[PDB]
Design a protein around this ligand. Structure first.
Ligand SMILES: O=C(NO)[C@H](O)[C@H](O)COP(=O)(O)O
Ligand SMILES: O=C(NO)[C@H](O)[C@H](O)COP(=O)(O)O
Ligand SMILES: [Zn+2]
Ligand SMILES: [Zn+2]
Ligand SMILES: [Zn+2]
Ligand SMILES: [Zn+2]
Ligand SMILES: [Zn+2]
Ligand SMILES: [Zn+2]
Ligand SMILES: [Zn+2]
Ligand SMILES: [Zn+2]
Ligand SMILES: [Zn+2]
Ligand SMILES: [Zn+2]
Ligand SMILES: [Zn+2]
Lengths: 216, 218
Protein backbone atom coordinates (compact mmCIF):
# COMPACT_ATOMS: atom_id res chain seq x y z
CA UNK A 1 0.00 0.00 0.00
CA UNK A 2 1.61 3.22 -1.23
CA UNK A 3 -0.03 5.65 1.21
CA UNK A 4 1.04 3.42 4.09
CA UNK A 5 4.64 3.26 2.86
CA UNK A 6 4.75 7.01 2.34
CA UNK A 7 3.36 7.68 5.83
CA UNK A 8 6.86 7.95 7.30
CA UNK A 9 7.47 11.07 5.17
CA UNK A 10 4.49 12.65 6.91
CA UNK A 11 0.88 13.16 5.83
CA UNK A 12 0.20 14.46 2.27
CA UNK A 13 0.27 18.16 3.21
CA UNK A 14 3.50 17.62 5.13
CA UNK A 15 4.97 15.70 2.18
CA UNK A 16 4.35 18.65 -0.14
CA UNK A 17 5.60 21.23 2.36
CA UNK A 18 8.80 19.27 3.06
CA UNK A 19 9.41 19.01 -0.70
CA UNK A 20 8.97 22.75 -1.19
CA UNK A 21 11.39 23.53 1.63
CA UNK A 22 13.98 21.07 0.29
CA UNK A 23 13.85 22.82 -3.07
CA UNK A 24 14.21 26.26 -1.42
CA UNK A 25 17.31 24.89 0.30
CA UNK A 26 18.72 23.74 -3.04
CA UNK A 27 18.14 20.03 -2.35
CA UNK A 28 16.49 17.49 -4.65
CA UNK A 29 13.17 15.71 -4.16
CA UNK A 30 11.60 12.47 -5.47
CA UNK A 31 8.27 12.61 -7.25
CA UNK A 32 6.10 9.56 -7.80
CA UNK A 33 3.32 9.68 -10.38
CA UNK A 34 0.07 7.67 -10.28
CA UNK A 35 0.42 3.91 -9.78
CA UNK A 36 -1.79 3.40 -12.83
CA UNK A 37 0.19 5.85 -15.00
CA UNK A 38 3.96 5.31 -15.12
CA UNK A 39 4.28 4.34 -11.46
CA UNK A 40 7.75 5.88 -11.61
CA UNK A 41 9.71 8.15 -9.31
CA UNK A 42 11.81 10.93 -10.77
CA UNK A 43 14.59 12.90 -9.12
CA UNK A 44 13.77 16.61 -9.39
CA UNK A 45 16.24 19.50 -8.94
CA UNK A 46 15.67 23.25 -9.13
CA UNK A 47 17.70 24.70 -12.02
CA UNK A 48 18.31 27.80 -9.88
CA UNK A 49 20.59 25.85 -7.51
CA UNK A 50 21.71 23.02 -9.81
CA UNK A 51 25.24 21.67 -9.21
CA UNK A 52 27.56 19.35 -11.11
CA UNK A 53 27.36 16.86 -8.24
CA UNK A 54 23.56 16.79 -8.43
CA UNK A 55 23.71 16.21 -12.17
CA UNK A 56 26.30 13.47 -11.67
CA UNK A 57 24.02 11.66 -9.21
CA UNK A 58 21.17 11.89 -11.68
CA UNK A 59 23.25 10.43 -14.51
CA UNK A 60 24.59 7.59 -12.37
CA UNK A 61 21.29 6.68 -10.66
CA UNK A 62 18.64 7.51 -13.25
CA UNK A 63 17.77 6.82 -16.89
CA UNK A 64 20.36 9.35 -18.02
CA UNK A 65 17.79 10.95 -20.28
CA UNK A 66 17.88 14.14 -18.24
CA UNK A 67 15.04 16.50 -19.10
CA UNK A 68 14.68 20.22 -18.61
CA UNK A 69 11.14 21.19 -17.60
CA UNK A 70 10.23 24.64 -18.92
CA UNK A 71 7.20 26.90 -18.97
CA UNK A 72 5.65 27.51 -22.39
CA UNK A 73 6.96 31.09 -22.13
CA UNK A 74 10.59 30.06 -21.62
CA UNK A 75 10.45 27.37 -24.34
CA UNK A 76 9.05 30.06 -26.64
CA UNK A 77 11.82 32.52 -25.68
CA UNK A 78 14.37 29.85 -26.67
CA UNK A 79 12.48 29.07 -29.90
CA UNK A 80 12.12 25.38 -29.06
CA UNK A 81 9.36 23.80 -31.13
CA UNK A 82 8.07 20.32 -30.30
CA UNK A 83 10.44 17.65 -31.57
CA UNK A 84 7.56 16.14 -33.52
CA UNK A 85 4.63 17.89 -35.22
CA UNK A 86 2.25 15.04 -34.31
CA UNK A 87 3.28 13.46 -30.99
CA UNK A 88 2.01 9.88 -30.60
CA UNK A 89 3.98 8.88 -27.51
CA UNK A 90 1.92 7.07 -24.85
CA UNK A 91 1.88 10.00 -22.38
CA UNK A 92 2.17 12.84 -24.92
CA UNK A 93 5.47 13.79 -23.24
CA UNK A 94 6.20 17.24 -24.60
CA UNK A 95 9.77 16.83 -25.89
CA UNK A 96 11.04 19.83 -27.77
CA UNK A 97 14.01 19.59 -30.07
CA UNK A 98 17.05 18.62 -28.02
CA UNK A 99 19.62 21.27 -27.08
CA UNK A 100 23.28 21.97 -26.37
CA UNK A 101 24.93 25.16 -25.14
CA UNK A 102 26.28 26.80 -28.29
CA UNK A 103 29.36 27.90 -26.31
CA UNK A 104 31.10 26.53 -23.24
CA UNK A 105 30.74 22.76 -23.60
CA UNK A 106 32.59 20.05 -25.48
CA UNK A 107 30.60 16.88 -26.20
CA UNK A 108 27.63 17.94 -24.12
CA UNK A 109 27.27 14.80 -21.99
CA UNK A 110 29.52 15.32 -18.97
CA UNK A 111 27.75 16.43 -15.79
CA UNK A 112 29.44 19.82 -16.15
CA UNK A 113 28.37 20.21 -19.81
CA UNK A 114 24.74 19.27 -19.14
CA UNK A 115 24.57 21.79 -16.28
CA UNK A 116 26.12 24.46 -18.54
CA UNK A 117 23.51 23.74 -21.22
CA UNK A 118 20.69 23.79 -18.67
CA UNK A 119 21.83 27.05 -17.05
CA UNK A 120 22.21 28.58 -20.51
CA UNK A 121 18.69 27.54 -21.48
CA UNK A 122 17.15 28.65 -18.16
CA UNK A 123 18.74 32.11 -18.17
CA UNK A 124 15.66 34.38 -18.11
CA UNK A 125 17.44 36.59 -20.66
CA UNK A 126 18.48 33.73 -22.98
CA UNK A 127 18.36 33.97 -26.80
CA UNK A 128 17.60 31.07 -29.17
CA UNK A 129 21.08 31.42 -30.70
CA UNK A 130 22.55 30.59 -27.25
CA UNK A 131 21.59 26.95 -27.93
CA UNK A 132 22.74 24.54 -30.62
CA UNK A 133 20.28 21.86 -31.79
CA UNK A 134 20.20 18.86 -31.60
CA UNK A 135 21.97 18.20 -28.29
CA UNK A 136 22.08 16.02 -25.18
CA UNK A 137 19.65 17.89 -22.94
CA UNK A 138 15.92 17.31 -23.49
CA UNK A 139 13.55 20.21 -22.80
CA UNK A 140 9.89 19.58 -22.03
CA UNK A 141 7.02 22.06 -22.34
CA UNK A 142 4.96 21.96 -19.15
CA UNK A 143 1.21 22.32 -19.72
CA UNK A 144 -0.48 25.55 -18.64
CA UNK A 145 -2.37 24.68 -15.46
CA UNK A 146 0.27 22.28 -14.16
CA UNK A 147 -0.84 19.11 -12.39
CA UNK A 148 -4.47 20.23 -12.54
CA UNK A 149 -4.16 20.03 -16.35
CA UNK A 150 -1.80 17.07 -16.74
CA UNK A 151 -0.68 14.61 -14.07
CA UNK A 152 2.85 14.14 -15.44
CA UNK A 153 6.26 14.59 -13.79
CA UNK A 154 6.80 17.55 -16.15
CA UNK A 155 3.93 19.50 -14.60
CA UNK A 156 4.84 18.32 -11.10
CA UNK A 157 8.32 19.76 -11.62
CA UNK A 158 7.24 23.21 -12.77
CA UNK A 159 4.42 23.33 -10.20
CA UNK A 160 6.84 22.49 -7.38
CA UNK A 161 9.15 25.34 -8.44
CA UNK A 162 6.31 27.85 -8.59
CA UNK A 163 4.80 26.68 -5.28
CA UNK A 164 8.23 26.99 -3.65
CA UNK A 165 8.62 30.53 -5.01
CA UNK A 166 11.53 29.52 -7.23
CA UNK A 167 12.27 30.22 -10.90
CA UNK A 168 9.97 27.87 -12.86
CA UNK A 169 12.59 25.59 -14.40
CA UNK A 170 13.51 22.15 -13.10
CA UNK A 171 15.50 19.12 -14.11
CA UNK A 172 13.99 15.68 -14.02
CA UNK A 173 15.01 12.04 -14.53
CA UNK A 174 13.60 8.60 -13.75
CA UNK A 175 15.21 6.64 -10.93
CA UNK A 176 16.50 3.32 -12.31
CA UNK A 177 17.57 0.12 -10.52
CA UNK A 178 21.03 -1.30 -11.27
CA UNK A 179 19.48 -4.24 -13.19
CA UNK A 180 17.79 -1.82 -15.58
CA UNK A 181 14.28 -2.10 -14.15
CA UNK A 182 12.63 1.12 -13.00
CA UNK A 183 12.50 1.95 -9.29
CA UNK A 184 9.15 1.49 -7.58
CA UNK A 185 7.93 2.96 -4.28
CA UNK A 186 10.15 0.89 -1.93
CA UNK A 187 13.30 1.73 -3.91
CA UNK A 188 12.30 5.40 -4.19
CA UNK A 189 11.73 5.60 -0.45
CA UNK A 190 15.12 3.93 0.14
CA UNK A 191 16.82 6.43 -2.20
CA UNK A 192 15.15 9.39 -0.49
CA UNK A 193 16.37 8.27 2.92
CA UNK A 194 19.89 7.75 1.58
CA UNK A 195 20.13 11.16 -0.03
CA UNK A 196 18.01 13.36 2.26
CA UNK A 197 15.44 13.88 -0.50
CA UNK A 198 11.75 14.30 0.36
CA UNK A 199 9.40 11.86 -1.40
CA UNK A 200 5.90 12.87 -2.57
CA UNK A 201 3.30 11.96 -5.19
CA UNK A 202 1.50 13.81 -7.91
CA UNK A 203 -1.77 13.15 -6.06
CA UNK A 204 -0.19 14.85 -2.99
CA UNK A 205 0.41 17.88 -5.20
CA UNK A 206 -3.05 17.81 -6.75
CA UNK A 207 -4.79 17.61 -3.35
CA UNK A 208 -2.57 20.40 -1.98
CA UNK A 209 -3.34 22.73 -4.91
CA UNK A 210 -7.07 22.01 -4.63
CA UNK A 211 -7.17 22.57 -0.87
CA UNK A 212 -5.34 25.88 -0.95
CA UNK A 213 -7.06 27.16 -4.10
CA UNK A 214 -3.70 27.49 -5.80
CA UNK A 215 -3.63 29.02 -9.26
CA UNK A 216 -0.05 29.14 -10.53
CA UNK B 1 56.45 10.07 -18.22
CA UNK B 2 52.96 9.36 -19.55
CA UNK B 3 52.94 7.18 -22.66
CA UNK B 4 50.54 8.19 -25.42
CA UNK B 5 47.18 6.61 -26.20
CA UNK B 6 48.59 4.23 -28.77
CA UNK B 7 51.05 2.96 -26.18
CA UNK B 8 48.36 2.48 -23.53
CA UNK B 9 46.41 0.46 -26.10
CA UNK B 10 49.34 -1.78 -27.05
CA UNK B 11 48.22 -4.44 -24.57
CA UNK B 12 45.19 -5.03 -26.82
CA UNK B 13 47.45 -5.69 -29.79
CA UNK B 14 48.61 -3.74 -32.84
CA UNK B 15 45.92 -1.61 -34.56
CA UNK B 16 44.81 -4.26 -37.07
CA UNK B 17 44.73 -6.88 -34.31
CA UNK B 18 42.65 -4.52 -32.15
CA UNK B 19 40.04 -4.35 -34.93
CA UNK B 20 40.06 -8.13 -35.52
CA UNK B 21 39.49 -8.77 -31.82
CA UNK B 22 36.60 -6.28 -31.82
CA UNK B 23 34.92 -8.03 -34.76
CA UNK B 24 35.21 -11.39 -33.04
CA UNK B 25 33.81 -10.05 -29.74
CA UNK B 26 30.77 -8.74 -31.62
CA UNK B 27 30.36 -12.09 -33.39
CA UNK B 28 30.44 -13.69 -29.93
CA UNK B 29 27.75 -11.26 -28.82
CA UNK B 30 30.07 -9.29 -26.54
CA UNK B 31 30.50 -5.53 -26.39
CA UNK B 32 33.43 -3.39 -27.54
CA UNK B 33 34.72 0.03 -26.51
CA UNK B 34 35.46 2.45 -29.35
CA UNK B 35 37.61 5.54 -28.89
CA UNK B 36 37.41 8.33 -31.45
CA UNK B 37 40.26 10.73 -32.36
CA UNK B 38 42.01 12.40 -29.43
CA UNK B 39 41.37 15.81 -31.02
CA UNK B 40 37.69 15.04 -31.66
CA UNK B 41 35.61 13.86 -28.69
CA UNK B 42 38.44 11.87 -27.11
CA UNK B 43 35.65 9.65 -25.74
CA UNK B 44 35.06 5.93 -25.51
CA UNK B 45 31.62 4.49 -26.25
CA UNK B 46 30.30 1.02 -25.47
CA UNK B 47 29.03 -0.68 -28.63
CA UNK B 48 26.72 -3.70 -28.78
CA UNK B 49 25.43 -5.59 -31.77
CA UNK B 50 21.65 -5.30 -31.98
CA UNK B 51 21.25 -8.88 -33.15
CA UNK B 52 22.58 -10.28 -29.81
CA UNK B 53 21.45 -7.40 -27.56
CA UNK B 54 20.26 -8.44 -24.08
CA UNK B 55 18.50 -6.63 -21.20
CA UNK B 56 21.64 -7.04 -19.05
CA UNK B 57 23.80 -5.38 -21.72
CA UNK B 58 21.41 -2.43 -21.88
CA UNK B 59 21.26 -2.19 -18.07
CA UNK B 60 25.06 -1.93 -17.98
CA UNK B 61 24.92 0.85 -20.54
CA UNK B 62 22.35 2.76 -18.53
CA UNK B 63 24.32 2.32 -15.31
CA UNK B 64 27.84 2.99 -16.64
CA UNK B 65 27.30 5.33 -19.58
CA UNK B 66 25.50 8.66 -20.27
CA UNK B 67 22.15 6.87 -20.51
CA UNK B 68 21.45 8.60 -23.79
CA UNK B 69 21.59 5.29 -25.60
CA UNK B 70 21.69 5.65 -29.38
CA UNK B 71 20.75 3.30 -32.21
CA UNK B 72 23.09 3.45 -35.18
CA UNK B 73 21.28 2.71 -38.45
CA UNK B 74 22.11 2.71 -42.15
CA UNK B 75 20.53 5.48 -44.21
CA UNK B 76 18.48 2.78 -45.94
CA UNK B 77 17.01 1.50 -42.68
CA UNK B 78 16.26 4.99 -41.30
CA UNK B 79 14.55 5.81 -44.61
CA UNK B 80 12.52 2.59 -44.43
CA UNK B 81 11.39 3.72 -40.95
CA UNK B 82 10.63 7.25 -42.18
CA UNK B 83 12.98 8.75 -39.59
CA UNK B 84 13.94 12.22 -40.77
CA UNK B 85 16.72 14.27 -39.12
CA UNK B 86 15.47 15.72 -35.82
CA UNK B 87 16.67 19.14 -37.03
CA UNK B 88 16.83 20.44 -40.60
CA UNK B 89 19.81 22.69 -39.87
CA UNK B 90 21.96 20.68 -37.46
CA UNK B 91 24.52 22.94 -35.78
CA UNK B 92 25.78 20.53 -33.14
CA UNK B 93 29.59 20.43 -32.85
CA UNK B 94 30.02 17.08 -34.65
CA UNK B 95 26.82 17.28 -36.72
CA UNK B 96 25.70 14.11 -34.92
CA UNK B 97 22.90 12.70 -37.05
CA UNK B 98 20.03 12.46 -34.54
CA UNK B 99 16.68 11.48 -35.99
CA UNK B 100 13.50 12.07 -34.06
CA UNK B 101 13.45 9.77 -31.03
CA UNK B 102 11.46 6.53 -31.07
CA UNK B 103 9.50 4.05 -28.98
CA UNK B 104 8.10 0.61 -29.71
CA UNK B 105 4.29 0.55 -29.78
CA UNK B 106 3.92 -3.01 -28.58
CA UNK B 107 5.67 -4.80 -25.77
CA UNK B 108 6.71 -1.75 -23.76
CA UNK B 109 5.31 0.55 -21.08
CA UNK B 110 7.16 3.78 -20.31
CA UNK B 111 9.95 2.90 -22.71
CA UNK B 112 12.86 3.69 -20.43
CA UNK B 113 13.55 0.36 -18.67
CA UNK B 114 16.46 -1.66 -20.03
CA UNK B 115 13.98 -4.22 -21.34
CA UNK B 116 11.83 -1.55 -22.99
CA UNK B 117 14.77 0.12 -24.78
CA UNK B 118 15.89 -3.29 -26.08
CA UNK B 119 12.36 -3.94 -27.36
CA UNK B 120 12.32 -0.58 -29.14
CA UNK B 121 15.76 -1.18 -30.62
CA UNK B 122 14.88 -4.70 -31.81
CA UNK B 123 11.67 -3.32 -33.35
CA UNK B 124 13.50 -0.51 -35.15
CA UNK B 125 16.41 -2.64 -36.39
CA UNK B 126 14.16 -5.31 -37.90
CA UNK B 127 14.86 -5.36 -41.67
CA UNK B 128 11.12 -5.69 -42.35
CA UNK B 129 10.17 -2.96 -39.87
CA UNK B 130 7.68 -0.29 -40.89
CA UNK B 131 7.46 3.38 -39.76
CA UNK B 132 4.23 2.68 -37.89
CA UNK B 133 5.97 0.09 -35.69
CA UNK B 134 7.55 3.06 -33.90
CA UNK B 135 5.99 5.89 -31.95
CA UNK B 136 7.72 9.28 -31.93
CA UNK B 137 9.08 10.80 -29.76
CA UNK B 138 10.47 8.15 -27.41
CA UNK B 139 13.46 7.19 -25.32
CA UNK B 140 15.74 5.61 -27.92
CA UNK B 141 17.79 7.91 -30.16
CA UNK B 142 18.50 6.73 -33.70
CA UNK B 143 21.51 8.05 -35.64
CA UNK B 144 21.97 7.98 -39.40
CA UNK B 145 25.41 6.56 -40.20
CA UNK B 146 27.16 8.15 -43.18
CA UNK B 147 27.60 6.08 -46.32
CA UNK B 148 31.24 5.03 -46.51
CA UNK B 149 31.62 4.54 -42.77
CA UNK B 150 34.79 5.69 -40.97
CA UNK B 151 36.52 6.42 -44.28
CA UNK B 152 33.90 9.17 -44.83
CA UNK B 153 33.08 10.38 -41.30
CA UNK B 154 35.18 9.59 -38.25
CA UNK B 155 32.31 9.32 -35.76
CA UNK B 156 31.37 6.56 -33.33
CA UNK B 157 28.16 6.24 -35.40
CA UNK B 158 30.09 5.16 -38.51
CA UNK B 159 32.45 3.09 -36.37
CA UNK B 160 29.45 1.19 -35.02
CA UNK B 161 27.84 0.36 -38.36
CA UNK B 162 31.20 -0.44 -39.99
CA UNK B 163 32.03 -2.91 -37.21
CA UNK B 164 28.67 -4.65 -37.64
CA UNK B 165 29.06 -4.92 -41.41
CA UNK B 166 32.66 -6.07 -41.24
CA UNK B 167 31.67 -8.69 -38.63
CA UNK B 168 28.91 -9.96 -40.93
CA UNK B 169 26.11 -9.00 -38.55
CA UNK B 170 22.83 -7.07 -38.77
CA UNK B 171 24.01 -3.54 -39.69
CA UNK B 172 22.73 -1.83 -36.55
CA UNK B 173 24.40 -1.23 -33.22
CA UNK B 174 23.75 0.29 -29.81
CA UNK B 175 26.05 3.08 -28.67
CA UNK B 176 26.65 5.03 -25.45
CA UNK B 177 29.45 7.11 -23.90
CA UNK B 178 31.30 5.61 -20.91
CA UNK B 179 30.88 7.96 -17.91
CA UNK B 180 32.65 8.22 -14.54
CA UNK B 181 30.67 8.19 -11.27
CA UNK B 182 31.57 11.83 -10.61
CA UNK B 183 30.00 12.79 -13.95
CA UNK B 184 33.18 13.37 -15.92
CA UNK B 185 33.55 11.33 -19.11
CA UNK B 186 35.73 8.23 -19.02
CA UNK B 187 39.14 8.67 -20.57
CA UNK B 188 41.53 6.10 -22.00
CA UNK B 189 42.96 4.52 -18.81
CA UNK B 190 39.46 4.11 -17.36
CA UNK B 191 38.12 2.83 -20.65
CA UNK B 192 40.92 0.26 -20.82
CA UNK B 193 40.23 -0.96 -17.27
CA UNK B 194 36.50 -1.12 -17.97
CA UNK B 195 37.19 -3.18 -21.09
CA UNK B 196 39.48 -5.60 -19.27
CA UNK B 197 36.99 -6.10 -16.41
CA UNK B 198 34.04 -6.57 -18.78
CA UNK B 199 35.89 -8.66 -21.40
CA UNK B 200 35.31 -5.97 -24.04
CA UNK B 201 38.13 -5.23 -26.46
CA UNK B 202 39.17 -1.63 -26.97
CA UNK B 203 39.98 0.00 -30.32
CA UNK B 204 40.06 3.40 -32.00
CA UNK B 205 38.52 4.93 -35.09
CA UNK B 206 42.01 5.32 -36.56
CA UNK B 207 42.55 1.56 -35.98
CA UNK B 208 39.41 0.95 -38.04
CA UNK B 209 40.53 3.33 -40.78
CA UNK B 210 43.95 1.64 -41.04
CA UNK B 211 42.30 -1.76 -41.02
CA UNK B 212 39.92 -0.87 -43.84
CA UNK B 213 42.77 0.68 -45.83
CA UNK B 214 44.93 -2.42 -45.40
CA UNK B 215 42.11 -4.94 -45.82
CA UNK B 216 39.85 -3.36 -48.46
CA UNK B 217 41.77 -0.96 -50.69
CA UNK B 218 43.61 -2.49 -53.65
O1 LIG C 1 9.42 9.95 -19.94
C1 LIG C 1 9.98 10.73 -19.17
N1 LIG C 1 11.13 11.49 -19.59
O2 LIG C 1 11.58 11.39 -20.81
C2 LIG C 1 9.50 10.83 -17.77
O3 LIG C 1 8.25 10.24 -17.69
C3 LIG C 1 9.53 12.23 -17.23
O4 LIG C 1 9.12 12.17 -15.91
C4 LIG C 1 8.69 13.24 -17.97
O5 LIG C 1 7.54 12.82 -18.61
P1 LIG C 1 6.12 12.93 -17.95
O6 LIG C 1 5.71 14.36 -17.71
O7 LIG C 1 5.17 12.28 -18.93
O8 LIG C 1 6.13 12.15 -16.65
O1 LIG D 1 27.07 12.20 -29.05
C1 LIG D 1 26.96 10.98 -28.97
N1 LIG D 1 25.68 10.39 -28.72
O2 LIG D 1 24.63 11.14 -28.56
C2 LIG D 1 28.15 10.08 -29.12
O3 LIG D 1 29.32 10.78 -29.37
C3 LIG D 1 27.95 9.01 -30.15
O4 LIG D 1 29.16 8.36 -30.25
C4 LIG D 1 27.54 9.47 -31.52
O5 LIG D 1 28.09 10.62 -32.06
P1 LIG D 1 29.28 10.62 -33.09
O6 LIG D 1 29.01 9.69 -34.26
O7 LIG D 1 29.42 12.03 -33.58
O8 LIG D 1 30.54 10.17 -32.38
ZN1 LIG E 1 3.88 29.22 -26.91
ZN1 LIG F 1 29.19 12.81 -28.93
ZN1 LIG G 1 7.30 10.75 -15.97
ZN1 LIG H 1 46.23 -9.95 -39.96
ZN1 LIG I 1 44.29 -10.95 -39.66
ZN1 LIG J 1 43.29 -11.91 -41.47
ZN1 LIG K 1 7.92 8.80 -18.90
ZN1 LIG L 1 30.78 9.99 -30.44
ZN1 LIG M 1 41.92 -4.86 -14.23
ZN1 LIG N 1 31.42 -2.38 -14.56
ZN1 LIG O 1 35.76 -4.07 -45.75
Amino acid sequence: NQSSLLAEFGDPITRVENALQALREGRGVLLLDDEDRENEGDIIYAVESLTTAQMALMIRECSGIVCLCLTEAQADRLALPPMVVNNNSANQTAFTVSIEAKHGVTTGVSAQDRVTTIKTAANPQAKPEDLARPGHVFPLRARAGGVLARRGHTEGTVDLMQMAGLQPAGVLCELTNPDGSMAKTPEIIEFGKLHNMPVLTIEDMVQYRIQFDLKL
